């Protein structure tokens, strides 16, 4: 009878455990019944509104053809059909990156001098190698904005207002500042994503911030790139050094970018703040600027 | 037929030498550094069982070049290690010699790949740490640093034109023998040419900053006088002839 | 106690301990987790018992014959410089001196056999580590005269730079009494 | 009233969610059902070949007993399971060392 | 991938290797590493010179 | 006040009477020879210099017993050598005095 | 009875003697180096379970 009451006890444990699992299952499907609430609106924006944005975006005939190509295949019953996911996931940043707009290029390094004079006081070491960076950024191997070179990654303590740094340079360059999550995240979905045959593979946060503005040349702050690593083995070294190479960046594919995106005039910045946590193949296309911090006064 | 080893400090042009030989052979060229390798698990593959299971560095190296016959440069085979179980020294042994690698495979792969035709180099830096059965059947070549004359030759003839050509300084900034004399004999002190690239870059992009703030002179001479203007201070002596005549 | 300041790669600190005085035989020993260049520098510092017994005013018996109980606070002692191993030598040099250090008055520099302070690297980082802690009296080698003005004009407003020329002059700028 | 109707439209939406989940999952066991009919079958021919190699290599009886008991452990998935690819390596080590 | 293996010259044993692992594709395409990692394998095989 | 040194014939009388008293006081007897013990790093702990720094043998005597107040017999106290850092005797004087 | 150890200088003929015997006895010569081994597992067998 002790065995029998043990059976009753373990039967109660298994019943509460299955009730728990069932309750969590209902909880998730509510989330899916609470999230799917705006699903129809997404399809509407991914429908005629999407096409209108494509028109204003005026994507290159090749890219527009692609959009139209997938879109004509996606032309059908919008409901009970995934055509909306492939019609938005890949065509949302394509409709959010108009090619009739772009950030005003400041060829005047002297202008940068002035706007960085009021970051805190100029800092006398940041702005000098930044101003190297701009004067070269105009004057390159092709005498244009092409790297074949470093983009000047930082090194220092994180304590400064580095957001305001990106904003004051995006002012001194008339750039549309963004921020993302790239460092600390350990999955290739904010950084690369993977080919659009599964969710969880995603536009990278660079693609998301690229969607955040229409200008074809924003500034995607590769946020705390010093802590970069990813649980997905198979390095984003291909991604990072392929986007760092403009010859590979105008052809920038990824695992996710199954079409070479025309990331040509796109500007990035690199940000390190720790001198050991580095995966090796970022030894190139990187160089370091002195960034002075704050004393107690 | 023994494989070349090019032991010596970094930055002495070992892999650019391989670039030259590739040009001389009209093949492609590639490197894969084995510096800081501690297992067979990545030289041969990890056995494919999950996302996050990878083939070997040689497989990658094969994948970047699009030719079956490149000239691989096995950089830093001396920094090859095994501090955890798994001694992959023998893995490189079966890679190098020509007969046995004819049907090479990694643990990630199953394909016996052909590697008899692929010319190899193998760069190390010191042979005193290579496993001794590895050390058989190669050629041990120390490659030195370069004399001050030789180093200014590297800069003036081969590096400084690259510095001025990456940063749009082409034909607008002239830099004299006195300046690069100051660069080596006054400022830069290292085995390879590696840091020279960096402080030369500091000079270079400071000069580009100077040219784009107004091209009052189309020819901006950076001689040994304004070297501390473009770069920082001379942090070592110009000549070792100037310290003191010491007693003992 | 001596302000053998060593700049950590992360943040900035003023490396120092509280010191005993328990002499007797040349085995001052620490599991400091030191680097290999600092390992060989320590192996040099072995015979630097015979070298620091003559370079300063320290007595002759220092050639082989001093203990003490030393506990370097940062067990992660490698701070990207040769300011790890000379710290024990400086601490003993203050210890065999038997007279203490100067309140809120640090020191730094590089020590040599001939008796001169070579300028210490990172005048900005050493002066951030010095000022962010709260010390306002600074002992820098004389060749940092041109590198005092290379720093921004907000670090050194509460800072007094007492320039030093010898390692003995460090001892007057660090040891508590007048000599 | 609008909160009531919002809850009703949430209830319909979670009803659709569970409908979708049972349908797609039913598809998952249909693909598995159609799979083991042939899809898993062809990969077994590898195991049959390895076993035939073990059977044909003349071995002592202790060898063969250890081989068969390790082999029965191998009668499971290994292709995403690092705990039975080691079994495949084991059995292939046994059949390819002379006896 | 079938087309790519078809065009990239394969040893016939390696050709059948790829065909078999292709049959280890066509079964799933999403979730666990079950054909995804097999897709990585096939992509590796295709993009090696032959 | 004394702690009753036992001296006289070697290997004769001393430990016997000590074990006798520990039987009388019903205190867990122990016995430690210090003839080969000539380092204070063996009386108190060894200063950490590698992996395997080690305590004094007196803690080890406390390690073989489950109380903090038995009767313990020490052996060979009448010699001394400063062959190592300092002397082992000073740490034993630290052991004797109650506030030490 | 013993198992014929060989000692001597690094470059002097040892493996030559081994292969000479091997051909002489009609044997397949082989070599396994044991430099730097400190684990029993790496030469006997490592734990099979993982
Ligand atoms: N009066 C006594 N009666 C019985 N046995 C004795 C007497 N005196 C000495 N002994 C013997 O002497 C020994 C004690 O000496 P031992 O324990 O060997 O070393 P130590 O005397 O140096 O501590 C005992 O074994 C005991 O048998
Ligand atoms: N006296 C010798 N006779 C024949 N071969 C030799 C002799 N000395 C060196 N060798 C060559 O040296 C190589 C190294 O192997 P071996 O000399 O047998 O032992 P070890 O590897 O210890 O030097 C062999 O391949 C052999 O061809």
Tab-separated table of N, CA, C and O in Angstrom, chain A residues 57 81 126 218 238 271 280 290:
chain	number	residue	atom	x	y	z
A	57	UNK	N	11.493	53.911	-53.739
A	57	UNK	CA	12.879	53.393	-53.552
A	57	UNK	C	13.576	53.382	-54.914
A	57	UNK	O	14.802	53.608	-54.952
A	81	UNK	N	-0.917	31.675	-46.626
A	81	UNK	CA	0.186	31.542	-47.612
A	81	UNK	C	1.447	32.232	-47.081
A	81	UNK	O	1.333	33.367	-46.576
A	126	UNK	N	41.284	61.887	-30.602
A	126	UNK	CA	40.246	61.287	-31.425
A	126	UNK	C	40.159	62.005	-32.742
A	126	UNK	O	40.365	61.397	-33.801
A	218	UNK	N	23.876	54.946	-44.838
A	218	UNK	CA	23.809	55.293	-43.420
A	218	UNK	C	25.113	54.951	-42.724
A	218	UNK	O	26.130	54.698	-43.378
A	238	UNK	N	34.071	35.645	-42.846
A	238	UNK	CA	33.610	35.890	-44.200
A	238	UNK	C	32.743	37.135	-44.258
A	238	UNK	O	33.010	38.030	-45.056
A	271	UNK	N	34.192	49.306	-33.504
A	271	UNK	CA	34.320	49.732	-32.118
A	271	UNK	C	34.848	48.616	-31.233
A	271	UNK	O	34.098	47.733	-30.814
A	280	UNK	N	40.829	36.313	-34.814
A	280	UNK	CA	42.028	36.727	-35.545
A	280	UNK	C	41.789	37.431	-36.889
A	280	UNK	O	42.387	38.494	-37.100
A	290	UNK	N	43.404	57.047	-30.635
A	290	UNK	CA	43.410	57.339	-29.205
A	290	UNK	C	42.165	58.124	-28.817
A	290	UNK	O	41.836	59.145	-29.427
